């Protein structure tokens, strides 16, 4: 069984928001539902990561570390792919029963957060990212940031990350282009991976503020509250090394 096929079989199932369309929309209502849905996506993301070959071989602390750093990167990227495949328009397919379209995009403060997610689906559509390239890239996003002083199993992590970088290269070569076109595609896809750090920084700026300001009454489920509570001090103590392919 090929490595990319083992990443394919563990793709998480499509979760529904449980959004009542008979009651009118509001930003608060949509954001609350999406946060609750996001908690369920993150619980599925742990099950997913545990089945990634090599992930379980890292120290338990490194497994926790990587999921906590990469959570929004994984979600933005999985959402971008889902949106790119299902609509080809300025649409965010958070769930089959909860699609963020142009009308929903005009709701107060909806766009300022949704635009970062739209950038992701826009870039996958612009670069015509394949399913195999996407699977390699998403596993690489889990391995995109480490602590300032590295991981407990740093040597093994560097070996696993190199393996998945080689996997991305194999998915690119399958597009049957020449040596020059292949090198250009590698450059383009790793440039998009690099840009995910900025996409996430913008998402987290708004997300952290919303979580901390209790007067907004925006609820987060236990899974997300726990990740945000862990991550906020790490960012303020500069405890994050963001791995980049380019300078």
């Amino acid at each position: 069984p090929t490595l990319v096929s083992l990443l394919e079989v563990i793709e998480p199932e499509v979760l529904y928001a449980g959004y009542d369309s008979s009651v009118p929309d509001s930003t608060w209502r949509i954001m609350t539902t999406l946060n609750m849905l996001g908690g369920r996506q993150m619980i599925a993301a742990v099950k997913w990561a545990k089945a990634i070959p090599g992930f379980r071989n890292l120290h338990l602390d490194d497994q926790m570390t990587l999921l906590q750093y990469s959570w929004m990167s994984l979600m933005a990227f999985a959402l971008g792919w889902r949106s790119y495949r299902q609509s080809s328009a300025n649409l965010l397919c958070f769930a089959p029963d909860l699609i963020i379209n142009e009308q929903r995009m005009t709701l107060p403060d909806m766009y300022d957060q949704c635009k970062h997610m739209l950038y992701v689906s826009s870039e996958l559509h612009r670069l015509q990212v394949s399913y195999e390239e996407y699977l390699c890239m998403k596993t690489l996003l889990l391995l995109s940031s480490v602590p300032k002083d590295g991981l407990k199993s740093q040597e093994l992590f560097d070996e696993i990350r190199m393996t998945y970088i080689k996997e991305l290269g194999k998915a690119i070569v399958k597009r049957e282009g020449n040596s020059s076109q292949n090198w250009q595609r590698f450059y383009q896809l790793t440039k998009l991976l690099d840009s995910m750090h900025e996409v996430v920084e913008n998402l987290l700026n708004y997300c952290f503020q919303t979580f901390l300001d209790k007067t907004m009454s925006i609820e987060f489920p236990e899974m997300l509250a726990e990740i945000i509570t862990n991550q906020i001090p790490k960012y303020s103590n500069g405890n994050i090394k963001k791995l980049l392919f380019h300078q």
Binding site: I43, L60, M64, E226, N230
Partner: peptide, 13 residues
């Protein structure tokens, strides 16, 4: 600290 996440990583799926 990070009780849910450690539980999800340690339990058998």
């Amino acid at each position: 600290e990070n009780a849910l996440l450690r539980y999800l990583l340690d339990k058998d799926d």
